[PDB]
Design a protein around this ligand. Structure first.
Ligand code: SF4
Ligand code: SF4
Ligand code: SF4
Length: 428
């Protein structure tokens, strides 16, 4: 009788964290509760009760016990390892492990969209990626995102997908649904942990062809299929040139076919990689989200909708009252994810804090040769972005400084004086 498989538990520099692998609700644990539950996980609730006996009498474990995180299924040196680990995290002052691992088994894509900066990139077997997958699993990764490139075009994709299902890792795969094999679709429809995400900009045939170079027919078909087989599905769109009418048009489609979740990502140009010109900014993206959410609730639709992108909080001057006190975890969870909450691995094995680091000319460590935990500790790229601090007047007066530090790190280092330059994305 230990901790539920549906729950993620990790030791952190401030004790520990609990996260639902479904509801995604979270609770910050202290050192006592963290060590208690760490034993509850490795030696059952009984042996855990033996230790901390005085604590239970002092109500120090009252809250921990009241949690519904338990299921059915040398403790001294196990407790020592816990203490050594927590101390090391305090030393490096980093989070335990990324919560999101993004993998790019292949960079090749059958399409070449204009809002894409990974188009035309032109691979290792799933056996290797399986090894990398185990490290993430055993180190406490919350979810794995499979991208590219068209991952359904990755030859060993079926094996990779199976490995994810077997390792019991919450996983998503993003596809254009153009040339996906029948074997691949079957694995997804019967999968319990893997969730497909469909790249679809609009139902309008003409516009989508301009944006993706294809009609939306095959994405629409695959979306309708999963609703039949009862498999959860998601739609992903980049806010480029769509009008509000074409957006709501796609909202209804998700409502009709019971799409699990619909996301609209902000669009960021990349000089020399993206052909399409940016029409809307983060302010416009906010108005859109406020528009869609009303339409969905005004129709009483159970559609999980959201907007996505970095520095989206810059479009809400209402907040940032300079009174925002962030918890030790929130201070590293919100904002730039490249710092503490995510990792990205390229097709050649190169490890990156973010995909944006691709265009950065600095040596990277290889995942097919070094351990993900070792890199997570001593990597120059992570240390660079983790330790960076802005000296901008407006930023230093800003409430969100800790999670932003004057905008996206990758953009700032390109400037003459990164420490003083504020990203144009923010106009506050
Ligand atoms: S389908 Fe996805 S990866 Fe392929 S070109 Fe378009 S955006 Fe880029
Ligand atoms: S480095 Fe830039 S693009 Fe990457 S997550 Fe952080 S803020 Fe966003
Ligand atoms: S760039 Fe500076 S002012 Fe703008 S949101 Fe980030 S820290 Fe606050």
């Amino acid at each position: 009788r230990t901790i539920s498989e549906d729950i993620l538990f990790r030791l952190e520099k401030f004790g520990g964290i609990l996260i639902n692998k479904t509801n995604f609700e979270r609770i910050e644990l202290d050192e006592t509760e963290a060590f208690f539950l760490y034993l509850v996980q490795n030696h059952g609730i009984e042996i855990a009760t033996s230790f901390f006996k005085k604590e239970i009498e002092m109500g120090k474990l009252e809250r921990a016990l009241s949690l519904n995180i338990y299921s059915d299924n040398n403790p001294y040196e196990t407790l020592q390892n816990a203490r050594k680990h927590v101390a090391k995290l305090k030393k490096h002052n980093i989070l335990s492990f990324p919560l999101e691992l993004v993998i790019y088994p292949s960079m090749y894509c059958d399409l070449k969209c204009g809002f894409c900066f990974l188009a035309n990139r032109e691979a290792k077997p799933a056996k290797d990626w399986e090894r990398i997958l185990r490290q993430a699993k055993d180190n406490g990764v919350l979810s794995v995102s499979i991208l590219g490139g068209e991952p359904t075009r990755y030859f060993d994709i079926d094996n990779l997908l199976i490995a994810c299902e077997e390792l019991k890792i919450k996983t998503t795969i993003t596809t254009n649904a153009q040339l996906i094999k029948k074997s691949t679709v079957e694995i997804l429809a019967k999968s319990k942990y893997i969730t497909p995400v469909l790249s679809l900009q609009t139902l309008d045939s003409k516009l989508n062809f301009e944006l993706m170079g294809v009609r939306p027919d095959r994405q629409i078909k695959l979306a309708k299929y999963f609703n039949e087989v009862g498999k959860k599905c998601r739609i992903n769109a980049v806010y480029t040139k769509q009008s509000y009418e074409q957006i709501i048009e796609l909202v209804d489609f998700c409502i009709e076919n019971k799409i699990d979740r619909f996301s609209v990502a902000n669009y960021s140009e990349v000089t020399g990689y993206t052909k399409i010109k940016k029409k809307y900014d983060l302010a416009d993206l906010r108005r859109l989200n406020e528009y869609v959410t009303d339409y969905i609730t005004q129709r009483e639709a159970n559609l999980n909708f959201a907007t996505e992108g970095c520095h989206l909080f810059t479009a809400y001057p209402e907040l940032i009252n300079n009174s925002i006190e962030f918890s030790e975890f929130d201070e590293m969870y919100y904002g730039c994810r490249a710092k503490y909450t995510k990792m990205e691995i390229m097709s050649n094995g190169d490890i990156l804090p973010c995909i944006a680091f691709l265009g950065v000319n600095q040596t990277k460590q290889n995942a097919f040769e070094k351990d993900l935990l070792d890199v997570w500790y001593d990597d120059p790229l992570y240390g660079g972005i983790r330790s960076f601090r802005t000296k901008n007047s407006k930023c230093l007066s800003c409430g969100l400084l800790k999670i932003c530090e004057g905008g996206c790190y990758v953009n700032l280092i390109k400037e003459k004086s990164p420490e003083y330059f504020r990203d144009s994305v923010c106009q506050l």
